[PDB]
Amino acid sequence: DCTGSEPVDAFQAFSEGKEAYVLVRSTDPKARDCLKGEPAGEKQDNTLPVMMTFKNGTDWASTDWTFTLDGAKVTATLGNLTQNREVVYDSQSHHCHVDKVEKEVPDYEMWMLDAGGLEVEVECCRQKLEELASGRNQMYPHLKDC
Numbered sequence: 001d002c003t004g005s006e007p008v009d010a011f012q013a014f015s016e017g018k019e020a021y022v023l024v025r026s027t028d029p030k031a032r033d034c035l036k037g038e039p040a041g042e043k044q045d046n047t048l049p050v051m052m053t054f055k056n057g058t059d060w061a062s063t064d065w066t067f068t069l070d071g072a073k074v075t076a077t078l079g080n081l082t083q084n085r086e087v088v089y090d091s092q093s094h095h096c097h098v099d100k101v102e103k104e105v106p107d108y109e110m111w112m113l114d115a116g117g118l119e120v121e122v123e124c125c126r127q128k129l130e131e132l133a134s135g136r137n138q139m140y141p142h143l144k145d146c
């Protein structure tokens with residue numbers, strides 16, 4: 001309140017591969033509609049296969065990514081694409097987390113359990129996202145007729 005999980009560990013922030021997370025806030029104007037990530041297999045050493053589901057226009061679509069975990073950092077790969085993230089905030093019970101997408105102009109994202117989370121924890125994630133966004137525009141992918 002609002003001291004979440006310290007230090008942040010990406011695998012624990014993903015409930016150790018036991019849950020799916022939904023994208024609820026993003027500073028990226030290209031954030032995919034209804035974006036959701038769910039584990040597609042067990043963690044092999046430091047590698048976790050993840051299926052991302054979202055709406056591509058009116059139809060549902062899916063992409064199979066490979067996540068490499070390193071402390072709070074996550075390197076996601078698909079074909080020739082590579083996305084580097086750092087989980088900068090993770091709530092007390094891993095009900096939600098805030099990521100920093102590492103690039104020329106870094107983006108900030110809020111992810112929460114598709115199964116639902118405690119209001120107090122969800123509020124802490126929202127607060128942390130608002131602080132890091134600092135006057136930038138925000139997208140709401142979960143409201144896109146999901």
Ligand SMILES: CCCCCC/C=C\CCCCCCCC(=O)O
Nearest residue numbers: 014021032037038039050052063076
């Ligand atoms: C197991 C919980 C994972 C939830 C956290 C998801 C983190 C990063 C997801 C980035 C995936 C990139 C989506 C881009 C859309 C695409 O082209 O497939």
